[PDB]
């Protein structure tokens, strides 16, 4: 059986606290970066609580956090502060392929305990563009950002993003082409900051997506 701990051990729980509101979800640590959902920044005027197996790190001002936005996708790369303990760089990413067999790798943090698991294997296919890919692995609210991994080679091919109103269809955001290069080539990095959304609804990958279930 494949060992997914090398993946689950890099998962971080993120809590964006701004203007009296909070958005919480998961991310994937890699070197000085944290890969996570773009909607984490529905707001960007507060603090970012980052929890991983290394401990709890808090960013005091999110507005100065350097970010790399992935065109058209619910994915963003965050460059953590210089004094943020770096994650390993063994993780592998790639675009989902036709006939991918996938599983969801998750991690959960409690006050006196913690746990991680890998779901059973299931199938998936592109929704229109391929920005979002449909899947049916059970996902609870709050698990956005959790990695979807290929059963074939252990590569991460996307991060969970959303579900339809009846939770019968789930959707993950696919890793874009040349993603690995993006992580290991500063020249390919487009660092910006202060970016935030202004609406409770967005139109990405051919779907209208709300920040929360109406």
């Amino acid at each position: 059986p494949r060992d997914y701990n090398p993946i689950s051990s890099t998962i971080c729980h993120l809590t964006n606290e701004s203007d009296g509101h909070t958005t919480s979800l998961y991310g994937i640590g890699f070197g000085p970066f944290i890969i996570t959902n773009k909607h984490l920044f529905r707001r960007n005027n507060g603090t970012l609580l980052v929890q991983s197996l290394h401990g709890v790190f808090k960013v005091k001002n999110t507005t100065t956090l350097q970010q790399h936005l992935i065109d058209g996708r619910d994915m963003i790369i965050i460059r953590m502060p210089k004094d943020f303990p770096p994650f390993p760089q063994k993780l592998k990413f790639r675009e989902p392929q036709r006939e991918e067999r996938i599983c969801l790798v998750t991690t959960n943090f409690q006050t006196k305990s913690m746990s991680s698991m890998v779901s059973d294997t299931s199938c998936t296919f592109p929704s229109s563009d391929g920005i979002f890919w449909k899947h049916w692995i059970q996902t609870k609210d709050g698990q956005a950002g959790s990695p979807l991994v290929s059963t074939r080679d252990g590569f991460i091919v996307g991060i969970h993003s959303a579900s339809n109103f009846t939770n019968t269809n789930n959707y993950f955001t696919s890793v874009p082409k040349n993603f690995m290069e993006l992580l290991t080539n500063q020249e390919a990095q487009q660092w910006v900051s202060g970016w935030r959304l202004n609406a409770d609804s967005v139109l990405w990958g051919g779907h209208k997506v709300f920040m929360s279930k109406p």
């Binding site: 109103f165 051919g206 709300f210």
Partner: peptide, 10 residues
């Protein structure tokens, strides 16, 4: 395509 909602937490 059906409308969706991000499964981020509170």
């Amino acid at each position: 395509t059906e409308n969706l909602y991000f499964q981020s937490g509170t």
